[PDB]
Amino acid sequence: ARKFFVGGNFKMNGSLESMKTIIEGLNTTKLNVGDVETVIFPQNMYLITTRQQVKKDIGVGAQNVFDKKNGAYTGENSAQSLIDAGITYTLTGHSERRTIFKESDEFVADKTKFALEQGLTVVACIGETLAEREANTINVVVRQLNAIADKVQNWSKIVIAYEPVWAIGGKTATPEQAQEVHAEIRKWATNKLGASVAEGLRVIYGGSVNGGNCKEFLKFHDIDGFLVGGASLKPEFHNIVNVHS
Amino acid sequence: RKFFVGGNFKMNGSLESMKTIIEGLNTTKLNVGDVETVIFPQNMYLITTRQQVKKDIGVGAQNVFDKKNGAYTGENSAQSLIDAGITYTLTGHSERRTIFKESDEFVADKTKFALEQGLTVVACIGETLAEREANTINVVVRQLNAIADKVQNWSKIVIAYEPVWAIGTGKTATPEQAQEVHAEIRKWATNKLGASVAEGLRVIYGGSVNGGNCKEFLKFHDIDGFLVGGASLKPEFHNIVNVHSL
């Protein structure tokens, strides 16, 4: 059985007051840590103070990382520096970085590989646009995942997040439609990586979800958790994290 | 023009080295009236750096996005920076223009937005090895004109002229060619912005500045400070930051 995983991507948001409020809120919600692996991904400048202030049962992750050792890359986050401060997770390949900053498949794979070597869990993000949904959903996620497979041998500390990029515009993606893609991701992992990798690999839904319908999403057969966007800034996040009780 | 010294830590650091780098700067005696000193740590250290480094030293981000808070995973927000007391940012560093393909226009746009939200911006400009052949002034003027297209008020801009071929290579420009590029930058600003704005505009030299070549620059009247890279992580930065006051 794959452990339920809930990540909260705060994106480019935050003030000192709102980060304190979110963190003190997570510190007081009743977590069954054996039931859920919970991680928050705050805007870069808050990474260290978030790790200091949020309780040990909640992981902290970066929203992006570069693919090289410490060096002359102004503006970037270092995988070495992150884990030296207790930041043990990172996103790679978020659709906003693929689309706005044109991060390539290979660059996302290279960042993933380096972050894994340096000791982080990587939430590697994938997903197709509306134009790609027309006929090429499977081919797009397969291409995105293949690029990571080319560089990464050990998947025990990857979790894949599927973003229905086509729906950020489109309407709301339904749980059915998520299940479809998730099943395809699990087929791909079985064929490329082996059944025992595919059966342990968390595939979390990255499209819009709230605490009321996330139960409807986990009713479907290949959805292991969520990468929550805007709800992760709100009290609603605690009802997604805590859904099993 | 108040002399300006910035220390760009780039993509370096650990808890332990950041602590002692800052400790070193705290116990360094400064003439704040004479030198505006700013350090730009790696993103994750931005708040702890502002908490630990004395008030006389400013803290800056190494980059910022050009929009209000929103769905730009992985970016630094100018509004969030100001809210936490981080009052400076770099824009247009050569490593971002080259590795991440930041265009003149994007750099100008994030400069304008950072300025609107309260930051002082150190906008970086500079020519490559190939461009040094015959095209130095063409390049830096194009890069400046893009900023001028977007920005009306230059009082909280500092210009950092950093020849790409001088970045981390040990090949410092000699002060004599640094002077003449800066003189051209000041002639460009005089024409575009007026003599009054040009005379107030800090133009600082970056690229392999270190504790040993810095004094030579101080003889030159259009070099208004330094942007220091590798050396800002080292104790000799304690010189560079005070050397104008000596």
Coordinates of C-alpha atoms in Angstrom, one line a residue:
Chain A
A1 CA 0.0 0.0 0.0
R2 CA 1.2 3.5 -0.9
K3 CA 1.3 6.0 1.9
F4 CA -1.2 8.9 1.4
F5 CA 0.8 12.0 0.5
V6 CA -0.5 15.6 0.7
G7 CA 1.8 18.4 -0.5
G8 CA 0.9 22.1 -0.2
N9 CA 2.4 24.4 -2.9
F10 CA 2.1 27.9 -1.6
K11 CA 3.4 29.3 -5.0
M12 CA 4.5 32.9 -5.1
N13 CA 2.5 34.0 -2.1
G14 CA 3.1 35.0 1.5
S15 CA 3.6 37.7 4.1
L16 CA 5.2 37.2 7.5
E17 CA 1.7 37.4 9.1
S18 CA 0.2 34.9 6.6
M19 CA 3.1 32.4 7.0
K20 CA 2.9 32.6 10.7
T21 CA -0.9 31.9 10.5
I22 CA -0.5 29.0 8.2
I23 CA 2.3 27.4 10.2
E24 CA 0.6 27.8 13.6
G25 CA -2.5 26.3 12.0
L26 CA -0.6 23.2 10.8
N27 CA 1.1 22.9 14.2
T28 CA -2.3 22.6 16.0
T29 CA -4.1 20.3 13.6
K30 CA -4.3 16.7 14.8
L31 CA -2.1 14.6 12.4
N32 CA -1.9 10.9 12.1
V33 CA 1.7 10.8 10.8
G34 CA 1.5 7.1 10.1
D35 CA -1.5 7.8 7.9
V36 CA -0.2 10.8 5.9
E37 CA 3.1 12.2 4.7
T38 CA 2.4 15.9 4.8
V39 CA 4.8 18.5 3.1
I40 CA 4.5 22.2 2.6
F41 CA 6.4 24.1 -0.2
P42 CA 6.6 27.8 0.8
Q43 CA 8.0 30.7 -1.3
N44 CA 11.8 30.5 -1.3
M45 CA 12.5 33.3 1.2
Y46 CA 10.5 31.5 3.9
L47 CA 12.2 28.1 3.6
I48 CA 14.4 28.2 6.7
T49 CA 12.0 30.0 9.0
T50 CA 9.3 27.6 7.9
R51 CA 11.4 24.5 8.8
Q52 CA 12.3 26.1 12.2
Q53 CA 8.7 26.9 13.1
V54 CA 6.6 24.0 11.8
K55 CA 6.6 20.7 13.7
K56 CA 8.8 17.8 12.7
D57 CA 5.9 15.7 11.5
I58 CA 5.4 18.1 8.6
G59 CA 8.0 18.2 5.9
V60 CA 9.2 21.3 4.2
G61 CA 10.2 21.6 0.5
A62 CA 11.5 24.0 -2.0
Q63 CA 9.3 25.0 -5.0
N64 CA 12.4 24.6 -7.4
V65 CA 16.0 23.6 -7.3
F66 CA 19.0 24.0 -9.7
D67 CA 20.8 20.9 -11.0
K68 CA 24.4 21.7 -10.0
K69 CA 26.5 21.8 -6.9
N70 CA 27.0 25.2 -5.1
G71 CA 28.3 27.8 -7.5
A72 CA 27.8 30.9 -9.6
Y73 CA 24.1 30.6 -10.4
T74 CA 22.6 33.9 -9.1
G75 CA 18.9 33.6 -8.1
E76 CA 18.8 29.8 -7.9
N77 CA 18.2 27.4 -5.0
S78 CA 20.9 24.8 -4.2
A79 CA 20.0 21.2 -3.3
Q80 CA 23.0 21.0 -1.0
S81 CA 22.0 24.2 0.8
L82 CA 18.4 23.1 1.2
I83 CA 19.1 19.8 2.9
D84 CA 21.9 21.4 5.0
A85 CA 19.0 23.5 6.6
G86 CA 16.6 20.6 7.0
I87 CA 14.6 21.2 3.8
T88 CA 14.2 17.6 2.7
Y89 CA 11.8 17.9 -0.3
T90 CA 11.6 19.8 -3.5
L91 CA 9.3 20.2 -6.5
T92 CA 10.7 19.8 -9.9
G93 CA 9.0 20.5 -13.3
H94 CA 5.9 22.3 -12.0
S95 CA 3.8 23.4 -14.9
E96 CA 4.4 27.0 -14.1
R97 CA 8.1 26.4 -14.5
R98 CA 7.7 24.4 -17.7
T99 CA 5.4 27.0 -19.3
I100 CA 6.6 30.4 -18.0
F101 CA 10.3 29.6 -17.7
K102 CA 10.4 27.0 -20.5
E103 CA 12.2 24.4 -18.3
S104 CA 12.9 21.4 -20.6
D105 CA 12.1 17.8 -19.9
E106 CA 15.8 17.1 -19.6
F107 CA 16.5 20.0 -17.3
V108 CA 13.7 18.7 -15.0
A109 CA 15.3 15.2 -15.1
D110 CA 18.7 16.7 -14.3
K111 CA 17.4 18.6 -11.3
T112 CA 15.5 15.5 -10.1
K113 CA 18.7 13.3 -10.3
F114 CA 20.9 15.8 -8.5
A115 CA 18.3 16.5 -5.7
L116 CA 17.9 12.7 -5.2
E117 CA 21.7 12.2 -5.0
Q118 CA 21.9 15.0 -2.4
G119 CA 19.3 13.3 -0.2
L120 CA 15.9 15.0 -1.0
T121 CA 12.6 13.5 -1.9
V122 CA 11.5 15.0 -5.3
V123 CA 7.9 15.7 -6.2
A124 CA 8.4 15.6 -10.0
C125 CA 5.5 17.3 -11.8
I126 CA 4.0 16.4 -15.2
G127 CA 1.0 17.1 -17.3
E128 CA -0.5 18.1 -20.6
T129 CA -2.0 21.3 -22.0
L130 CA -5.4 21.6 -23.6
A131 CA -4.0 21.4 -27.1
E132 CA -2.1 18.3 -26.1
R133 CA -5.3 16.8 -24.5
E134 CA -6.9 16.8 -27.9
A135 CA -5.0 13.6 -28.9
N136 CA -1.7 13.2 -27.0
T137 CA -2.3 13.0 -23.3
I138 CA -0.5 9.6 -22.9
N139 CA 2.3 10.6 -25.2
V140 CA 3.0 13.8 -23.4
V141 CA 3.2 12.4 -19.8
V142 CA 5.1 9.4 -21.2
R143 CA 7.7 11.7 -22.8
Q144 CA 7.9 13.8 -19.6
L145 CA 8.4 10.7 -17.5
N146 CA 10.9 9.0 -19.9
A147 CA 13.2 12.0 -19.6
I148 CA 13.3 11.5 -15.8
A149 CA 13.8 7.7 -16.2
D150 CA 16.8 8.4 -18.5
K151 CA 18.6 10.1 -15.6
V152 CA 17.2 8.4 -12.4
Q153 CA 17.8 4.8 -11.4
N154 CA 16.3 4.8 -7.9
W155 CA 12.6 5.9 -7.7
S156 CA 12.0 5.2 -4.0
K157 CA 12.2 8.9 -3.2
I158 CA 10.2 10.3 -6.2
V159 CA 6.5 11.0 -6.1
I160 CA 4.9 12.0 -9.4
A161 CA 2.4 14.9 -9.4
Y162 CA -0.1 15.0 -12.3
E163 CA -1.3 18.5 -13.2
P164 CA -4.3 18.8 -15.5
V165 CA -2.8 21.9 -17.2
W166 CA -5.6 21.7 -19.8
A167 CA -8.1 22.5 -17.0
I168 CA -6.5 25.8 -15.8
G169 CA -8.3 28.1 -18.2
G170 CA -11.0 24.6 -19.7
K171 CA -13.4 23.8 -16.7
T172 CA -12.8 21.6 -13.7
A173 CA -11.2 18.2 -14.2
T174 CA -13.4 15.5 -12.8
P175 CA -12.2 12.6 -10.7
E176 CA -12.9 10.2 -13.5
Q177 CA -10.6 12.2 -15.8
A178 CA -7.9 12.2 -13.1
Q179 CA -8.2 8.4 -12.6
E180 CA -7.8 7.8 -16.4
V181 CA -4.4 9.7 -16.5
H182 CA -3.2 8.2 -13.2
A183 CA -3.9 4.7 -14.5
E184 CA -1.8 5.6 -17.6
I185 CA 1.0 6.8 -15.4
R186 CA 1.0 3.6 -13.5
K187 CA 0.9 1.5 -16.7
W188 CA 4.0 3.5 -17.9
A189 CA 5.8 2.9 -14.7
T190 CA 5.0 -0.9 -14.8
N191 CA 6.3 -1.1 -18.4
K192 CA 9.4 1.1 -17.9
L193 CA 10.3 0.4 -14.3
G194 CA 8.9 -2.9 -13.2
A195 CA 5.7 -3.8 -11.4
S196 CA 7.3 -3.5 -7.9
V197 CA 8.3 0.1 -8.6
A198 CA 4.9 1.0 -10.1
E199 CA 3.1 -0.5 -7.1
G200 CA 5.1 1.6 -4.6
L201 CA 5.1 4.8 -6.6
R202 CA 2.9 7.7 -5.3
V203 CA 1.0 9.4 -8.1
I204 CA -0.7 12.5 -6.6
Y205 CA -3.3 14.6 -8.2
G206 CA -2.2 18.2 -8.8
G207 CA -5.5 19.7 -10.0
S208 CA -8.0 21.7 -8.0
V209 CA -9.4 20.0 -4.9
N210 CA -11.0 20.9 -1.7
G211 CA -11.7 18.9 1.5
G212 CA -15.2 18.0 0.5
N213 CA -14.5 16.2 -2.8
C214 CA -11.0 14.9 -2.2
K215 CA -12.8 11.9 -0.8
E216 CA -14.4 11.5 -4.2
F217 CA -10.9 11.6 -5.8
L218 CA -9.5 9.0 -3.5
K219 CA -12.4 6.7 -4.3
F220 CA -10.6 6.2 -7.7
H221 CA -8.2 3.4 -8.0
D222 CA -4.8 5.0 -8.9
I223 CA -4.8 8.4 -7.0
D224 CA -2.5 8.4 -4.0
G225 CA -2.7 11.9 -2.6
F226 CA -2.7 15.5 -3.7
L227 CA -0.4 18.4 -4.7
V228 CA -2.7 21.2 -3.5
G229 CA -2.4 24.7 -4.9
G230 CA -4.5 27.6 -3.6
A231 CA -6.3 25.6 -1.0
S232 CA -2.9 25.0 0.7
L233 CA -2.9 28.7 1.9
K234 CA -6.3 28.3 3.6
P235 CA -7.9 26.5 6.5
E236 CA -9.2 24.1 3.9
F237 CA -5.8 22.5 3.6
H238 CA -6.3 20.8 7.0
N239 CA -9.4 19.1 5.8
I240 CA -7.4 17.6 2.9
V241 CA -4.4 16.5 5.0
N242 CA -6.8 15.0 7.6
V243 CA -9.3 13.5 5.3
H244 CA -9.0 9.9 6.6
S245 CA -10.3 10.9 10.0
Chain B
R1 CA 26.8 59.8 -5.5
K2 CA 27.2 57.7 -2.3
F3 CA 29.7 54.9 -2.9
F4 CA 27.9 51.5 -3.1
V5 CA 29.3 48.0 -2.3
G6 CA 27.2 44.9 -2.9
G7 CA 28.2 41.3 -2.1
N8 CA 26.5 38.7 -4.3
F9 CA 26.8 35.3 -2.5
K10 CA 25.3 33.6 -5.6
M11 CA 24.2 30.0 -5.2
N12 CA 26.4 29.3 -2.1
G13 CA 26.0 28.7 1.6
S14 CA 25.4 26.5 4.6
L15 CA 23.9 27.3 8.0
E16 CA 27.4 27.4 9.4
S17 CA 29.1 29.4 6.8
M18 CA 26.3 32.0 6.5
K19 CA 26.4 32.4 10.3
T20 CA 30.1 33.2 10.3
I21 CA 30.1 35.4 7.2
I22 CA 27.4 37.5 8.7
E23 CA 29.2 37.5 12.1
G24 CA 32.3 38.7 10.4
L25 CA 30.4 41.7 8.8
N26 CA 28.7 42.5 12.1
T27 CA 32.0 42.9 13.9
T28 CA 33.4 45.0 11.0
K29 CA 33.4 48.7 11.8
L30 CA 31.6 50.7 9.0
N31 CA 31.3 54.3 8.0
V32 CA 27.7 54.1 6.9
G33 CA 27.6 57.8 5.9
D34 CA 30.4 57.0 3.4
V35 CA 29.4 53.6 1.9
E36 CA 26.1 51.9 1.2
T37 CA 26.7 48.2 1.8
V38 CA 24.3 45.5 0.7
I39 CA 24.5 41.7 0.7
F40 CA 22.5 39.4 -1.5
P41 CA 22.4 35.9 0.0
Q42 CA 20.9 32.7 -1.6
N43 CA 17.1 32.9 -1.6
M44 CA 16.6 30.5 1.3
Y45 CA 18.7 32.7 3.6
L46 CA 16.9 36.0 2.9
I47 CA 15.0 36.2 6.2
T48 CA 17.6 34.8 8.5
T49 CA 20.2 37.1 6.9
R50 CA 18.0 40.2 7.6
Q51 CA 17.5 38.9 11.1
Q52 CA 21.2 38.4 11.9
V53 CA 23.1 41.1 9.9
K54 CA 23.2 44.5 11.6
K55 CA 20.8 47.2 10.5
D56 CA 23.6 49.3 8.9
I57 CA 23.9 46.6 6.1
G58 CA 21.1 46.1 3.6
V59 CA 19.9 42.7 2.4
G60 CA 18.8 42.1 -1.2
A61 CA 17.4 39.3 -3.2
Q62 CA 19.4 37.8 -6.1
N63 CA 16.3 38.0 -8.4
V64 CA 12.6 38.8 -8.3
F65 CA 9.6 38.2 -10.6
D66 CA 7.7 41.0 -12.3
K67 CA 4.2 40.4 -11.0
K68 CA 2.1 40.6 -7.8
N69 CA 1.7 37.6 -5.6
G70 CA 0.3 34.7 -7.5
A71 CA 0.9 31.4 -9.3
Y72 CA 4.6 31.6 -10.2
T73 CA 5.9 28.5 -8.5
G74 CA 9.6 28.9 -7.5
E75 CA 9.9 32.7 -7.9
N76 CA 10.7 35.5 -5.4
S77 CA 7.9 38.1 -4.8
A78 CA 8.9 41.7 -4.6
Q79 CA 5.9 42.3 -2.3
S80 CA 7.0 39.5 0.0
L81 CA 10.6 40.8 0.1
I82 CA 9.5 44.3 1.2
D83 CA 7.1 42.9 3.8
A84 CA 10.0 41.1 5.5
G85 CA 12.4 44.0 5.4
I86 CA 14.4 42.9 2.4
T87 CA 14.8 46.3 0.6
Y88 CA 17.1 45.5 -2.4
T89 CA 17.2 43.1 -5.4
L90 CA 19.4 42.3 -8.3
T91 CA 17.9 42.2 -11.7
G92 CA 19.5 41.1 -14.9
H93 CA 22.6 39.4 -13.5
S94 CA 24.7 37.9 -16.3
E95 CA 24.1 34.4 -15.0
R96 CA 20.3 34.9 -15.4
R97 CA 20.6 36.5 -18.8
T98 CA 22.8 33.7 -20.1
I99 CA 21.6 30.5 -18.3
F100 CA 17.9 31.4 -18.1
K101 CA 17.7 33.6 -21.2
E102 CA 16.2 36.7 -19.4
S103 CA 15.7 39.3 -22.1
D104 CA 16.3 43.0 -21.9
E105 CA 12.6 43.5 -21.7
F106 CA 11.9 41.0 -19.0
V107 CA 14.8 42.5 -16.9
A108 CA 13.3 46.0 -17.4
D109 CA 9.9 44.7 -16.5
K110 CA 11.0 43.2 -13.2
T111 CA 13.1 46.3 -12.5
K112 CA 10.0 48.5 -12.9
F113 CA 7.8 46.3 -10.8
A114 CA 10.5 46.0 -8.0
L115 CA 10.8 49.7 -8.0
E116 CA 7.0 50.2 -7.8
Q117 CA 6.8 47.9 -4.8
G118 CA 9.6 49.8 -2.8
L119 CA 12.8 48.0 -3.6
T120 CA 16.1 49.5 -4.6
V121 CA 17.2 47.6 -7.8
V122 CA 20.8 46.9 -8.8
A123 CA 20.2 46.4 -12.5
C124 CA 23.1 44.5 -14.1
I125 CA 24.4 45.0 -17.7
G126 CA 27.4 43.9 -19.5
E127 CA 29.1 42.5 -22.7
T128 CA 30.5 39.0 -23.4
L129 CA 34.0 38.1 -24.5
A130 CA 32.9 38.1 -28.2
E131 CA 31.1 41.4 -27.7
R132 CA 34.2 43.1 -26.2
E133 CA 35.7 43.0 -29.8
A134 CA 33.9 46.0 -31.2
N135 CA 30.4 46.1 -29.6
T136 CA 30.8 46.9 -25.8
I137 CA 28.9 50.2 -25.9
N138 CA 26.2 48.9 -28.3
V139 CA 25.3 46.1 -25.9
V140 CA 25.2 48.1 -22.7
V141 CA 23.2 50.9 -24.3
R142 CA 20.6 48.5 -25.6
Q143 CA 20.3 47.0 -22.2
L144 CA 20.0 50.4 -20.6
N145 CA 17.4 51.7 -23.2
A146 CA 15.2 48.7 -22.4
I147 CA 15.1 49.7 -18.7
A148 CA 14.6 53.4 -19.6
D149 CA 11.6 52.3 -21.8
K150 CA 9.9 51.0 -18.7
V151 CA 11.2 53.0 -15.8
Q152 CA 10.5 56.8 -15.4
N153 CA 12.3 57.3 -12.0
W154 CA 15.9 56.3 -11.5
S155 CA 16.5 57.5 -8.0
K156 CA 16.4 53.9 -6.6
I157 CA 18.3 52.2 -9.5
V158 CA 22.0 51.3 -9.2
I159 CA 23.6 50.2 -12.5
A160 CA 26.1 47.3 -12.2
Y161 CA 28.5 47.1 -15.2
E162 CA 29.9 43.6 -15.1
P163 CA 31.7 42.4 -18.2
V164 CA 30.7 38.7 -18.6
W165 CA 34.3 37.8 -19.4
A166 CA 35.3 39.2 -16.0
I167 CA 32.9 37.1 -13.9
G168 CA 34.6 34.5 -11.7
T169 CA 37.5 34.3 -14.3
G170 CA 40.1 36.3 -12.4
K171 CA 40.3 38.6 -15.5
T172 CA 39.3 41.9 -13.9
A173 CA 38.8 44.7 -16.4
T174 CA 41.6 47.2 -15.7
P175 CA 40.1 50.4 -13.9
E176 CA 41.1 52.3 -17.1
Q177 CA 38.7 50.5 -19.3
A178 CA 36.1 50.3 -16.5
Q179 CA 36.3 54.1 -16.3
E180 CA 35.6 54.6 -20.0
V181 CA 32.6 52.3 -20.1
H182 CA 31.2 54.0 -17.1
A183 CA 31.9 57.3 -18.7
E184 CA 29.9 56.2 -21.7
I185 CA 27.1 55.0 -19.4
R186 CA 27.0 58.4 -17.8
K187 CA 27.0 60.1 -21.2
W188 CA 24.0 57.8 -22.2
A189 CA 22.2 58.7 -19.0
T190 CA 22.8 62.4 -19.5
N191 CA 21.3 62.2 -22.9
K192 CA 18.3 60.0 -22.0
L193 CA 17.5 61.1 -18.4
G194 CA 19.1 64.5 -18.1
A195 CA 22.3 65.8 -16.4
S196 CA 20.7 65.9 -13.0
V197 CA 19.7 62.2 -13.0
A198 CA 23.0 61.2 -14.6
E199 CA 25.0 62.9 -11.9
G200 CA 23.1 61.1 -9.1
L201 CA 23.2 57.6 -10.8
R202 CA 25.5 55.1 -9.1
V203 CA 27.4 53.0 -11.8
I204 CA 29.3 50.2 -10.0
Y205 CA 31.8 47.8 -11.4
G206 CA 31.5 44.1 -11.1
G207 CA 33.7 41.1 -12.1
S208 CA 36.6 39.6 -10.2
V209 CA 36.7 42.5 -7.7
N210 CA 38.7 41.4 -4.7
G211 CA 40.7 42.6 -1.7
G212 CA 43.8 43.2 -3.9
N213 CA 42.7 44.9 -7.1
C214 CA 39.9 47.2 -5.5
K215 CA 42.0 50.2 -4.4
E216 CA 43.1 50.8 -7.9
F217 CA 39.5 51.6 -9.0
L218 CA 38.9 54.3 -6.3
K219 CA 41.0 56.9 -8.4
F220 CA 38.3 56.9 -11.1
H221 CA 35.4 59.3 -10.8
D222 CA 32.7 57.4 -12.7
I223 CA 33.2 54.2 -10.8
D224 CA 30.7 54.5 -7.9
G225 CA 31.3 51.2 -6.2
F226 CA 31.6 47.4 -6.7
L227 CA 29.5 44.4 -7.1
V228 CA 31.6 41.6 -5.5
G229 CA 31.0 37.9 -6.2
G230 CA 33.3 35.2 -5.0
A231 CA 35.2 37.5 -2.6
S232 CA 32.0 38.5 -0.7
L233 CA 32.1 35.0 0.9
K234 CA 35.6 35.7 2.2
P235 CA 37.1 37.8 5.0
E236 CA 38.7 40.2 2.6
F237 CA 35.2 41.5 1.8
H238 CA 35.7 43.2 5.2
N239 CA 38.3 45.3 3.4
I240 CA 36.4 46.0 0.2
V241 CA 33.4 47.3 2.2
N242 CA 35.5 49.7 4.3
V243 CA 38.2 50.5 1.8
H244 CA 36.5 53.6 0.4
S245 CA 36.4 55.1 4.0
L246 CA 40.2 54.6 4.6

